[PDB]
Ligand binder design. Structure first.
Ligand SMILES: [Mg+2]
Ligand code: NA
Length: 360
DNA sequence: AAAA
């Protein structure tokens, strides 16, 4: 019997139900925009469970025994089986508010509030926003518009690997024992991504050395002329605090949101200049204390739905509190240690789910 | 105030 929890399902990139899940993902995104958290969650859970199926749904009978498929969701599935299209998802794709929100938030530095503001001002295109003489843009938005075409184009695996080399080369210059791991979608087996994320940790670095590494690495790139954008968020990590109770847990580790200049010569692909000879790439770096590296790796590998269900399962089924920094057992009244993701899964009483099986 |  298929579990209601993504952390008890294996979800690989061979999705046999993309016709259904692309429609459910659009409906979930619209409910997020319309601030309908409940309807958003119901569509996300339904989309997630269909992504785990090893076969395509071809009739309503095929949905028998599948959890997280309410009456509203089953009406949407029925409509797609009928003529290969979702009239509901088609109406969202043609909605002016939905189109504007997708288009405006595609800019780095533009979120829900700024997209809503521009829509209510009567803006509908990025050309009209950029050329407006009354609008004032944040430094993040200026970078978002300047490098827009590069940031909107997919980062592929040769580019992600080229970025990994740059990150490792810079990091070991200041901390030679540091462990650098690519996380996010690429760790889950994805061919593309909007950004490249890394977890950095050092077994021998001091509290101060750990704090200074992201500043040293970004100053080095600034000197080389590779730092196009940089925002460093200082750590608010607390060694002895209980893990988050929130549905969507916050990460308190030191991190930085960057835009790096990736020279074409560094990329070893099949297509190896054409234009400027470089590509702007969104990169995130996270630095964590050595003893929390398994919790941080688990949180940053994702997917977002896999993380939500992991934390929900820990709370509701095991009376445990899990977040990117720790695992606390409320019955035993102890923090649980882990040197690997496998040990976290074993503490939770879960069969180990490989990173490429976490595409929930 | 509003970047996973
Ligand atoms: Mg990612
Ligand atoms: Na955005």
């Amino acid at each position: 019997k298929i579990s209601q929890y993504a952390c008890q399902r294996r979800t690989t990139l061979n999705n046999y139900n993309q016709l259904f899940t692309d429609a459910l993902d659009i409906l979930a995104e619209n409910d997020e925009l319309r601030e309908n958290e409940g309807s958003c969650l119901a569509f996300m859970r339904a989309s997630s469970v269909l992504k785990s199926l090893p076969f395509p749904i071809t009739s309503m009978k095929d949905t028998e025994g599948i959890p997280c498929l309410g009456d509203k969701v089953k009406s949407i599935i029925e409509g797609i089986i009928e003529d290969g299209e979702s009239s509901e998802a088609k109406a969202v794709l043609n909605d002016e508010r939905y189109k504007s929100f997708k288009l405006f938030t595609s800019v780095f530095g533009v979120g829900l509030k700024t997209a809503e503001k521009w829509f209510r001002m009567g803006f509908r295109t990025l050309s009209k926003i950029q050329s407006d003489k009354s609008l004032r843009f944040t430094q993040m938005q200026k970078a978002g518009f300047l490098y827009y075409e590069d940031l909107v184009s997919c980062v592929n695996r040769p580019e992600a690997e080229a970025v990994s080399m740059l990150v490792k080369e810079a990091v070991v210059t200041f901390l030679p024992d540091a462990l650098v791991t690519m996380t996010g979608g690429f760790r889950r087996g994805k061919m593309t991504g909007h950004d490249v994320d890394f977890l950095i940790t050092s077994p021998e670095a001091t509290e101060d050395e750990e704090q200074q590494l992201l500043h040293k690495v970004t100053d080095f790139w600034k000197q080389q002329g590779l730092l196009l954008y940089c925002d460093i968020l200082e750590s608010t990590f607390e060694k002895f605090k209980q893990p988050s109770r929130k549905v969507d847990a916050l990460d308190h580790f030191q991190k930085c949101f960057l835009i790096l200049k990736l020279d074409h010569g560094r990329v070893h692909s099949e297509k190896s200049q054409e234009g400027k000879g470089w590509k702007a790439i969104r990169v995130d770096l996270v630095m964590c204390p050595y003893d929390r590296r398994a919790f941080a790796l688990l949180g940053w590998t994702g997917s977002r739905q896999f993380e939500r269900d992991l934390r929900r399962y820990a709370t509701h089924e095991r009376k445990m509190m899990l977040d990117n920094h720790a695992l606390y057992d409320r019955t035993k009244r102890v923090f649980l240690e882990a040197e690997s993701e496998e040990e976290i899964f074993a503490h939770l009483g879960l069969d180990y789910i490989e990173p490429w099986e976490r595409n929930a």
